[PDB]
Amino acid sequence: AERGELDLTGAKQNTGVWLVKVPKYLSQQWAKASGRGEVGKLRIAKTQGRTEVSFTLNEDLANEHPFVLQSVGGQTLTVFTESSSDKLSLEGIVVQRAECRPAASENYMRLKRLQIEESSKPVRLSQQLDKVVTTNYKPVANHQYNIEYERKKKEDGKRARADKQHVLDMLFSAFEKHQYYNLKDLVDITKQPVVYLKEILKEIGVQNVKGIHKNTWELKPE
């Protein structure tokens, strides 16, 4: 299945990418840009024995984040893509990991605490009650029970028995589908009193039980 084939073009080109840790809040601010263009700019400052990398937010989207690089000498990381068109491709390889450190410190936290309020807050117990009794708003004729009676209130409690021969026709038809049947299936199928149907099954058949009183009746095929 070609759908199961993994494209190696990227790998064979030795394409490199960066892997960066940034806060959900930074990416949420980025989400406001909605891909309209850019979210900001990245700056790289290099000196005598030091490299300073940072990101700075767009003045527009805002209407310094320093980067810390991590080691990748003890692991290999690559990027592979999963298309909506059900195709897989190794689009390229991760050459560096890093973490974005927040410039603001202790007051940020308030925002965080505000953020804490946003993640954590469905009311727990919280307001009690001063009211008490409501229950049992009197059905006098139970509301489901009323509905069941209503179902009954459409021609029930009377069966054919009475049409014997036509009922026999149903038995013959049913028996054509399978050699044996449960009594319950015949009761559903012929809509008649069970004891009368038993007298018929005594007339033209036998019974065959198994397990825990599991009984099936049959017109002795031969």
Binding site: R124, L125, Q128, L129, V132, K184, D188, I189
Partner: protein, 138 residues
């Protein structure tokens, strides 16, 4: 009013530690563990447990020996926020009234309060009905 600059005399004697101590017992008290554990048990523990993992669903055993159509009737139950009244007593008349811990001891009652919970019924039948939802306070 403090500045940690003009202050030059941090010294403080036997008297002041008891002033600290007194403020401890005066704020906390002599039985807080019990009381905080029970207060946390209602305010937290009982709500978490009714939310934790008890959704129950039941699907009727219909359309036996004959079935087709579209519905083996199915029901789901969910439990929301828990409510807890102030300690109450129901007199034989049927009339509730507030219960006084002293009265509870003389008449030999159980000093307890009623617990109520939000229960929901959801009927996402196998086709036609799906938006049959009703709220209860039980």
């Amino acid at each position: 009013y403090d500045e940690d600059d003009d202050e030059i005399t941090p010294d403080l004697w036997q008297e002041a530690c008891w002033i600290v101590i007194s403020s401890y017992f005066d704020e906390k008290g002599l039985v807080r563990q019990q009381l905080d554990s029970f207060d946390e048990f209602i305010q937290m523990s009982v709500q978490r447990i009714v939310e934790d993992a008890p959704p129950i669903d039941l699907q009727a055993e219909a359309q036996h020996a004959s079935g087709e159509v579209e519905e083996p009737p199915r029901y789901l139950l969910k439990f929301e926020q828990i409510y807890l009244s102030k300690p109450t007593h129901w007199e034989r008349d049927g009339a509730p009234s507030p219960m006084m811990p002293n009265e509870a001891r003389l008449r030999n009652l159980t000093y307890s309060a009623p617990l109520y919970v939000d229960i929901t019924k959801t009927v996402i039948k196998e086709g036609e009905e799906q938006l049959q939802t009703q709220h209860q306070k039980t």
